[PDB]
Design a binder for this molecule. Structure first.
Ligand SMILES: *[C@@H]1O[C@H](CO)[C@@H](O)[C@H](O)[C@H]1NC(C)=O
Ligand SMILES: *[C@@H]1O[C@H](CO)[C@@H](O)[C@H](O)[C@H]1NC(C)=O
Ligand SMILES: [Ca+2]
Ligand SMILES: [Ca+2]
Ligand SMILES: [Ca+2]
Ligand SMILES: [Ca+2]
Ligand SMILES: [Ca+2]
Ligand SMILES: [Ca+2]
Ligand SMILES: [Ca+2]
Ligand SMILES: [Ca+2]
Ligand SMILES: [Cl-]
Ligand SMILES: [Cl-]
Ligand SMILES: [Cl-]
Ligand SMILES: [Cl-]
Ligand code: NA
Ligand code: NA
Ligand code: NA
Ligand code: NA
Ligand code: NA
Ligand code: NA
Lengths: 284, 284
């Protein structure tokens, strides 16, 4: 309807026509203010103490595009809370207390290009949780407890140019995930449990080359440092890249344990014919 | 013995007589280097990826004073790991993955004046864990999951001048804890579950006073903001202090819900004679 504009007592509401924005940031709120005009395009709740997301909070916000909950203490989100936002392109949940991501949490958002989850305690993400977010251009999981993510849903995100997994428990990356993703310019796996990384043509751009007539800048940013790397032939493709030394370190095999990844010559990365690994490349 | 000095390959060892220091910081280590001279006074491991503390790591370090493990990913500490350090005055565990503090973890350290635990996932601290640390001048629990701490052990720390509890789940502070602690200059309870705060004479110094012939600086730093304050007569002593407005907010009673703590007049903080609280001050 054509009702007059609603603004919470503690917030500031801006109208730059047609758009309307509700800025509540750093007001000390313990919960989402009850009266927020449903026509708000941008909603800034960041740097508050809100602990809970009620179903009624964001209900019926059709034109809502940016929503920033960052730096709140949030342990719970009522199901179907975001179910009413079709137009939301960006959502910032970072620096909260979320321990889990359910299937129904993000289920409604088709138009979302940015999902920022970093600096939470999340130990788990449900299998279908990312099925509807396939339009994401940015996904930040950094600084969490995750040992795995819905890889099958991630390999279906075509336009994603940034994936930040750093500072997690992730022990494995499936081998074919990035094949169909040609927009990815950034992957940060730093401080994880990875013993191995899958080869991808994208990673061929993670090195600097020159003296061909042009000095080629690095067009892909990859950081694998801080992982318990098991150093064998499977990582040789990575050892062949010409890169800065980030102090990456091999966890295994025992003779390579403790030594810098780039300080090891290429000839000393060895796979053992048939238990390292385990018809591997030697053949059997 | 008089053995030659041991230094790890990746570290730098300084001798300023008599003292010896081993600086391993930011070397990318996945574990504590095995050879570290047992006579080291200061050991800097910060900004590494070490995940585990073995019994042998710090064993037999008698003269060790400062030990900084900060900004590591550490989920486990072998029992009796610190049992051999009598002279340790400072220990920095901050920014790690520790989820728990056992009874045997700190059991050995009498001389410890500084314990920095901030930015961990700790949900629990065992009842006797702090019994031996009674000499602590600084204890930083900030940014954790704690709902309670060994208050009985804390009220026995006489020389403690700083306690940082901020950004936790703590729902209650016992009423008599700070009575015997006259050295405390700082308490940060910000972003907790506290509905109430106990009155203490120390908190009488948390306000600024002037026009008596001297403008008195604030000699005690207290931050209670970001708590679900239940606003009744029990907090009146706090409302009487003349302080900056940090945007503290009452969670309850319903008529005070959402309103700024300092925007409420003193006459509107009311306790109800006999269920708020519950022979309370009205008498029964
Ligand atoms: C959402 O919309 C429905 C109908 O469109 C209405 O009944 C309900 O009260 C609305 N809720 C909010 C929080 O606006
Ligand atoms: C610690 O000292 C004991 C005896 O003093 C010795 O047997 C043991 O090997 C030492 N361990 C380390 C790690 O220095
Ligand atoms: Ca964009
Ligand atoms: Ca495929
Ligand atoms: Ca393709
Ligand atoms: Ca690790
Ligand atoms: Ca000191
Ligand atoms: Ca007492
Ligand atoms: Ca006394
Ligand atoms: Ca809170
Ligand atoms: Cl927090
Ligand atoms: Cl974390
Ligand atoms: Cl970490
Ligand atoms: Cl935290
Ligand atoms: Na906050
Ligand atoms: Na946080
Ligand atoms: Na390994
Ligand atoms: Na680190
Ligand atoms: Na951390
Ligand atoms: Na309350």
């Amino acid at each position: 309807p054509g009702d007059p504009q609603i603004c919470p007592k503690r917030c500031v509401c801006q109208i730059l026509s047609p758009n309307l924005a509700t800025l509540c940031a750093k007001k000390g709120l313990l919960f989402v203010p009850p009266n927020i005009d449903r026509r708000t395009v941008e909603l800034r709740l960041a740097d508050n103490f809100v602990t809970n997301i009620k179903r009624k909070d964001f209900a019926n916000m059709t034109s809502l595009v940016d929503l920033t909950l960052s730096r709140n203490t949030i342990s719970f989100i009522t199901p179907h809370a975001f179910a009413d936002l079709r137009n939301l392109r960006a959502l910032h949940l970072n620096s909260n207390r979320l321990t889990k991501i359910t299937n129904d949490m993000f289920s409604g958002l088709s138009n979302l290009h940015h999902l920022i989850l970093n600096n939470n305690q999340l130990t788990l993400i449900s299998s279908t949780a990312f099925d509807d977010v396939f339009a994401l251009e940015e996904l930040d999981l950094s600084y969490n407890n995750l040992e795995t993510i819905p890889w099958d849903a991630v390999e279906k995100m075509v336009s994603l140019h940034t994936l930040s997994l750093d500072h997690n428990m992730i022990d494995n990356i499936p081998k074919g995930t990035f094949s169909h993703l040609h927009k990815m310019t950034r992957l940060d796996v730093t401080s994880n449990k990875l013993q191995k990384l899958p080869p991808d043509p994208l990673f061929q751009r993670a090195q600097v080359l020159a003296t061909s007539g042009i000095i080629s800048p690095s067009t892909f940013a990859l950081s694998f440092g801080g992982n318990p790397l098991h150093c064998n032939c499977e990582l040789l493709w990575l050892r062949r890249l010409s890169r800065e030394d980030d102090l990456e370190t091999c966890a295994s095999p025992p003779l390579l344990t403790g030594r810098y990844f780039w300080s090891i010559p290429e000839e000393e990365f060895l796979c053992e014919p048939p238990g390292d690994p385990e018809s591997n490349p030697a053949g059997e």
